Amino acid sequence: KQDMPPVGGYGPIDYKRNLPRRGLSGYSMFAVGIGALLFGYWSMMKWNRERRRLQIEDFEARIALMP
Amino acid sequence: VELPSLEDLKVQEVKVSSSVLKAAAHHYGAQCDKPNKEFMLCRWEEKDPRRCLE
C-alpha cells in the first residue's frame, strides 16, 4: 500500500529559452566611444604644449651659458 | 707653428659643481652681455682661437 504517486505539488520548470538583458544597443553605443576618445585628445595640447614650454626652458639654460 | 706660453694660464677657474652651475643659469648671462657676445665674434666670425685668448 506504500507506493509513490503524490497527490499534488508540481511546477513545472520551463522549457523556455530567453534572457534578453540588453544592454544599451542601437546608436547608444559608438557614442560613449567617440566622446571619450576626443576627451583623451582634449587632454593633449594642455600637456604636450605645456611640456613644449618647458622644453624651450630646458634649452634656455644651455644657450645662456657657454660663452 | 707657435703656441703661447704657460703664462696667461692658471687663472681663477670657477670651481663649482654642475648642478649649482645650472642652478642660477638664467640670471647669469642675462645682465653681463659685454664680453660674451664680443667673445663670440672673436670665435665665430674670426677662427683660430689663438689670436683669441684674452
Swiss-Prot record, chain A:
Chain ranges passing through the membrane: 24-45
Cell location: Mitochondrion inner membrane; Nucleus
Q: Which domain of life is it from?
A: Eukaryota
Oligomeric form and interacting partners:
Complex I is composed of 45 different subunits. Interacts with CARD15, but not with CARD4. Interacts with STAT3, but not with STAT1, STAT2 and STAT5A. Interacts with OLFM4.
Q: Which family does it belong to?
A: Belongs to the complex I NDUFA13 subunit family.
Briefly, what is this protein's role?
Accessory subunit of the mitochondrial membrane respiratory chain NADH dehydrogenase (Complex I), that is believed not to be involved in catalysis. Complex I functions in the transfer of electrons from NADH to the respiratory chain. The immediate electron acceptor for the enzyme is believed to be ubiquinone. Involved in the interferon/all-trans-retinoic acid (IFN/RA) induced cell death. This apoptotic activity is inhibited by interaction with viral IRF1. Prevents the transactivation of STAT3 target genes.
Task: Please state what the protein is called.
Answer: NADH dehydrogenase [ubiquinone] 1 alpha subcomplex subunit 13
| The encoding gene | NDUFA13
Q: Which residues of the full protein are shown?
A: 7 to 73 of 144
Swiss-Prot record, chain B:
On the tree of life, the source organism's domain of life is: Eukaryota
Record localization? Mitochondrion inner membrane; Mitochondrion intermembrane space; Mitochondrion
Motif Cx9C motif 1, chain ranges: 32-42
Disulfide pairs here are 42-52
- Provide the CHCH domain boundaries: 29-54
What role does it play?
A: Accessory subunit of the mitochondrial membrane respiratory chain NADH dehydrogenase (Complex I), that is believed not to be involved in catalysis. Complex I functions in the transfer of electrons from NADH to the respiratory chain. The immediate electron acceptor for the enzyme is believed to be ubiquinone.
Domain-level remarks: Contains four C-X9-C motifs that are predicted to form a helix-coil-helix structure, permitting the formation of intramolecular disulfide bonds.
Query: To which protein family does this belong?
Result: Belongs to the complex I NDUFA8 subunit family.
**Quaternary organization:** Complex I is composed of 45 different subunits.
Which protein, by its recorded name, is this? NADH dehydrogenase [ubiquinone] 1 alpha subcomplex subunit 8
